[PDB]
Amino acid sequence: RFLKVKNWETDVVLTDTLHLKSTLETGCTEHICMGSIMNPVRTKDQLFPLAKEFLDQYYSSIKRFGSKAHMDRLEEVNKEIESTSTYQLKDTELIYGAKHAWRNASRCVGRIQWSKLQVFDARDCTTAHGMFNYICNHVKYATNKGNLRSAITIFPQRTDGKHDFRVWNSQLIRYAGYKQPDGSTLGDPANVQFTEICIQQGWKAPRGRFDVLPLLLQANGNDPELFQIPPELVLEVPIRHPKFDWFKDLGLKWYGLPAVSNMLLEIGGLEFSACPFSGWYMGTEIGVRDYCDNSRYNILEEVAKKMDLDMRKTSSLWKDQALVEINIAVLYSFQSDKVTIVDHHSATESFIKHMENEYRCRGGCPADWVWIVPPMSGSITPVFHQEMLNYRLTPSFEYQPDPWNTHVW
Amino acid sequence: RFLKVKNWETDVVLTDTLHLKSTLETGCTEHICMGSIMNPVRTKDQLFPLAKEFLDQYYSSIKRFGSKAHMDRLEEVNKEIESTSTYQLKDTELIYGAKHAWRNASRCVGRIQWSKLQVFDARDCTTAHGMFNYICNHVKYATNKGNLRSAITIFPQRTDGKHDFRVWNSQLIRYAGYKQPDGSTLGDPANVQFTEICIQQGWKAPRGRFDVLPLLLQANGNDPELFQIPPELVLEVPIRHPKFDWFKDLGLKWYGLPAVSNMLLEIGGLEFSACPFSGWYMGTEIGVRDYCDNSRYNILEEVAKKMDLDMRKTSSLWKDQALVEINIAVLYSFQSDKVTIVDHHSATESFIKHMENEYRCRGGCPADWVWIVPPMSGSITPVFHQEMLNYRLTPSFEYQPDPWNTHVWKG
Ligand code: HEM
Ligand code: HEM
Ligand SMILES: C[C@H](O)[C@@H](O)c1cnc2nc(N)nc(N)c2n1
Ligand SMILES: C[C@H](O)[C@@H](O)c1cnc2nc(N)nc(N)c2n1
Ligand SMILES: NC(=[NH2+])NCCC[C@H](N)C(=O)O
Ligand SMILES: NC(=[NH2+])NCCC[C@H](N)C(=O)O
Ligand SMILES: [Zn+2]
Numbered sequence: 001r002f003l004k005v006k007n008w009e010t011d012v013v014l015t016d017t018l019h020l021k022s023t024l025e026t027g028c029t030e031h032i033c034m035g036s037i038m039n040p041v042r043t044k045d046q047l048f049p050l051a052k053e054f055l056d057q058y059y060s061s062i063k064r065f066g067s068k069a070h071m072d073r074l075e076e077v078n079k080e081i082e083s084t085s086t087y088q089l090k091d092t093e094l095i096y097g098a099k100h101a102w103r104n105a106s107r108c109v110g111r112i113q114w115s116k117l118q119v120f121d122a123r124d125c126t127t128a129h130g131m132f133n134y135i136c137n138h139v140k141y142a143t144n145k146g147n148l149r150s151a152i153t154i155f156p157q158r159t160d161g162k163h164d165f166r167v168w169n170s171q172l173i174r175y176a177g178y179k180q181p182d183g184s185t186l187g188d189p190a191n192v193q194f195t196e197i198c199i200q201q202g203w204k205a206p207r208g209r210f211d212v213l214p215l216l217l218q219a220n221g222n223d224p225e226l227f228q229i230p231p232e233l234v235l236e237v238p239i240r241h242p243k244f245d246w247f248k249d250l251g252l253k254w255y256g257l258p259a260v261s262n263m264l265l266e267i268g269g270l271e272f273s274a275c276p277f278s279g280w281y282m283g284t285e286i287g288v289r290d291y292c293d294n295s296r297y298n299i300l301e302e303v304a305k306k307m308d309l310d311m312r313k314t315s316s317l318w319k320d321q322a323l324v325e326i327n328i329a330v331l332y333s334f335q336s337d338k339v340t341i342v343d344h345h346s347a348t349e350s351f352i353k354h355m356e357n358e359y360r361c362r363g364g365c366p367a368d369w370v371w372i373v374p375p376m377s378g379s380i381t382p383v384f385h386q387e388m389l390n391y392r393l394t395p396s397f398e399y400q401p402d403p404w405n406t407h408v409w
Numbered sequence: 410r411f412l413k414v415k416n417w418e419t420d421v422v423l424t425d426t427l428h429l430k431s432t433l434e435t436g437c438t439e440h441i442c443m444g445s446i447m448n449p450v451r452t453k454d455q456l457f458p459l460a461k462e463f464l465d466q467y468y469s470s471i472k473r474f475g476s477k478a479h480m481d482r483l484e485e486v487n488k489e490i491e492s493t494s495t496y497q498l499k500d501t502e503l504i505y506g507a508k509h510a511w512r513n514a515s516r517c518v519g520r521i522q523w524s525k526l527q528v529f530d531a532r533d534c535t536t537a538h539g540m541f542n543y544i545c546n547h548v549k550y551a552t553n554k555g556n557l558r559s560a561i562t563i564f565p566q567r568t569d570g571k572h573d574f575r576v577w578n579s580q581l582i583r584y585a586g587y588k589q590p591d592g593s594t595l596g597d598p599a600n601v602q603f604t605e606i607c608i609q610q611g612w613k614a615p616r617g618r619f620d621v622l623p624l625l626l627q628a629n630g631n632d633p634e635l636f637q638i639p640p641e642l643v644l645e646v647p648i649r650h651p652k653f654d655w656f657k658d659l660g661l662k663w664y665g666l667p668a669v670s671n672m673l674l675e676i677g678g679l680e681f682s683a684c685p686f687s688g689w690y691m692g693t694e695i696g697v698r699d700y701c702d703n704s705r706y707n708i709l710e711e712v713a714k715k716m717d718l719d720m721r722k723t724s725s726l727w728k729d730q731a732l733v734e735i736n737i738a739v740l741y742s743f744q745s746d747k748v749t750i751v752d753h754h755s756a757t758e759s760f761i762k763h764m765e766n767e768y769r770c771r772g773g774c775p776a777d778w779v780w781i782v783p784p785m786s787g788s789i790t791p792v793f794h795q796e797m798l799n800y801r802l803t804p805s806f807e808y809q810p811d812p813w814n815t816h817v818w819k820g
Binding site: 030031035289317374376378388389 | 412414415417418419428431434435436437438439440441442443444445446447692697698701702703704709723724725726728729730732733736737740744752754755758778779782783784785786787788789793794795796797798799800
């Protein structure tokens with residue numbers, strides 16, 4: 001019922017009570033654990049409950065739980081649901097809902113910043129051009145000349161599943177992927193399929209290695225449209241090393257604004273299918289994963305060669321030596337160009353602090369160890385030795401089907 | 410019910426059917442996952458089934474399921490159970506049980522070697538002195554002058570829970586740790602408490618930074634006794650770096666035989682409380698955890714100083730650069746002395762093949778991602794990108810409370 005988590009390095013012991021309020025499922029059972037599995041239209045009777053659940057916590061957060069205002073709202077929404085078969089959140093409810101969806105994101109190590117989220121209410125949007133205007137404004141505001149500020153833009157909620165707003169890109173900004181005749185892959189293998197759909201829709205693919213993909217926007221269920229993000233808005237960073245000057249020769253560059261855009265935001269039962277959000281990078285995301293994953297830009301060997309490391313045997317740890325240098329470079333290049341970025345040590349230390357804060361001020365913090373521990377130097381970051389309890393609270397960010405496997409043209 | 414796991418790096422999908430034969434719990438519910446949590450006497454009544462399930466799996470494996478020998482053995486066991494409230498395994502079943510406990514250890518990345526396990530039957534042992542002799546033979550056989558061989562020694566099973574055999578050591582070979590009055594710690598911080606017990610039991614600690622702990626053995630529920638492992642049997646490796654001539658001056662060295670000795674081996678419902686086992690090290694266990702955890706030897710700083718890295722700001726990744734060098738040194742020192750050891754790239758690569766093989770020939774491979782992925786360079790090793798299913802099958806290795814917390818002293 002009441003659980004405890006121990007940090008095996010500091011012997012600290014936090015007591016979790018927040019999970020008692022858990023709602024969704026975890027994908028696990030007493031028989032089997034799926035902790036390492038990537039991913040283990042509502043009716044009126046379904047919505048009333050969710051809505052009630054949300055308002056209670058909302059009014060409870062503003063210290064007016066069971067007030068008249070509280071009861072009034074709950075009554076108004078219930079009426080609206082019976083009549084319209086859905087409802088609209090007050091601006092204050094939206095902001096609270098969004099900030100809390102981020103607060104509950106058990107896979108985000110950067111949640112200590114949760115309360116500072118800038119919310120852009122784009123619920124009055126009606127067309128894809130409108131979406132393009134809203135997104136550009138978001139990118140600009142968040143980039144802030146390098147002094148990144150977290151943000152989220154919320155388009156209209158779902159109604160009947162046939163008038164959904166969606167951003168087909170998985171991130172507002174990403175590099176294109178083209179399968180070459182060589183059999184190899186040019187650019188970013190992760191977006192090969194998305195790139196094909198752009199071309200298949202008209203994009204004039206430049207066929208380069210780091211071509212900023214075009215936004216593909218779907219408004220009110222209509223077919224998606226293309227737009228090219230004002231280049232002057234896409235801040236980028238050329239990657240160099242603070243010692244190896246041959247580094248710049250790999251011709252590597254990465255964008256400064258990470259902005260996940262394919263997720264679904266759920267607040268009080270309502271579903272916001274187009275809700276791009278952004279913060280700033282933790283070095284390892286680019287350095288370790290985007291650059292070295294075998295299925296991404298896989299630049300380990302090349303960097304290994306340039307370093308003249310004995311790549312004859314795995315035990316020389318040449319892959320490890322190289323991995324470290326690529327990550328020093330990334331962090332280096334960003335800090336030099338003066339763009340916000342955080343290293344895995346600093347970030348994890350912050351998350352540990354945030355966890356303790358959460359356990360005392362809220363009674364817990366759902367965390368997914370598998371995703372919290374960085375992809376490099378795991379055990380030398382504090383979160384590795386930190387036991388975690390993973391559970392699903394709402395408001396939340398959910399995964400959702402890539403629209404192309406769903407859109408009825 | 411069939412379950413599927415994908416590898417996000419090779420898109421290869423596998424199907425798990427083996428989880429259907431899972432029995433024990435996982436600590437998890439549909440409302441909460443505890444996959445990152447360290448750790449979430451039997452009666453005739455409950456023993457009959459456990460014995461039957463075991464004999465069935467055993468007889469199926471030798472391809473004699475349903476045979477007369479299978480049926481007689483099953484009748485033999487039951488008569489014995491209700492006759493004596495327990496039963497004795499045959500040598501072959503014991504060997505099979507041990508090998509499968511290893512095969513089912515979801516936290517072990519070295520399982521590709523499960524079938525080559527050397528099983529030593531010490532079920533005829535009656536005293537602590539007897540246990541010590543058995544333990545010396547295991548260390549000697551397993552070490553094999555540097556060419557390590559996996560092995561396990563199995564002492565008498567639990568009967569009434571008052572006559573238990575236990576190896577109070579957590580590993581047969583491990584360095585002492587001593588709390589200094591100024592708060593610091595000399596030696597290995599992980600063994601401070603056990604070291605204190607050994608001293609209290611009469612051990613004359615030389616108080617150095619790498620003193621091999623004495624064995625503290627409990628036979629048939631009696632009070633534990635001390636034994637010094639013959640020094641000529643404890644193989645050690647001086648730690649030096651292939652290019653940093655100053656590394657050797659750090660005074661570091663490590664033992665070559667990793668032999669966990671505090672677990673419990675469950676086979677056919679029977680409980681073996683003393684079952685030390687050993688294989689060989691994966692570099693990271695020593696170079697990442699034993700040397701760099703802040704709660705172990707914590708040498709990152711010193712190594713860092715000598716290399717003169719920018720230790721002013723973590724964003725220089727100085728910790729990360731030192732970690733790599735230390736692990737390179739560990740792998741290099743063992744290889745030079747010709748002491749079996751395996752780097753994490755090779756072990757995880759090997760474990761991924763074993764796992765695929767296991768799905769194909771067994772219908773699954775229970776695995777704990779949290780423990781399989783190495784403590785450094787996680788995503789550049791194949792297991793990181795591999796979805797896994799964690800569930801517990803028997804035979805199995807279980808945690809058991811430290812004996813000093815439960816032993817009823819005799820004086
Ligand atoms: C400002 C600093 C931020 C940092 C350092 C941070 C860091 C991260 C990291 C390292 C992960 C895993 C990333 C991956 O491996 O793909 C993550 C996941 C996530 N973050 Fe954040 N984040 C930031 C801002 C945000 C914001 C503004 C939100 C939401 C409004 C958010 C919501 C989430 C969610 C839902 C996930 C999981 C996404 C998935 O499943 O792929 N993060 N974040
Ligand atoms: C062949 C050499 C071996 C290698 C390279 C290997 C590797 C490993 C590693 C790296 C771990 C995690 C270690 C830790 O963090 O403490 C592990 C866990 C484990 N191994 Fe092995 N192993 C070997 C042999 C064995 C043998 C012979 C057995 C069984 C008889 C075995 C049973 C286990 C079990 C039960 C665990 C989990 C222990 C726990 O929960 O603390 N391993 N092994
Ligand atoms: C989901 C799979 O186990 C594996 O692909 C995996 C594990 N942990 C992860 N953690 C983080 N932070 N990101 C990704 N992409 C991860 N991917
Ligand atoms: C049990 C805690 O989550 C943490 O201390 C933790 C995580 N992963 C591990 N993995 C391995 N291989 N060994 C140990 N000791 C580990 N310890
Ligand atoms: N720090 C963040 N907000 N990250 C969002 C996901 C970005 C993704 N992991 C990448 O490397 O591009
Ligand atoms: N590879 C093995 N069999 N390891 C057994 C556990 C050893 C433990 N990780 C140590 O560093 O001492
Ligand atoms: Zn679980």
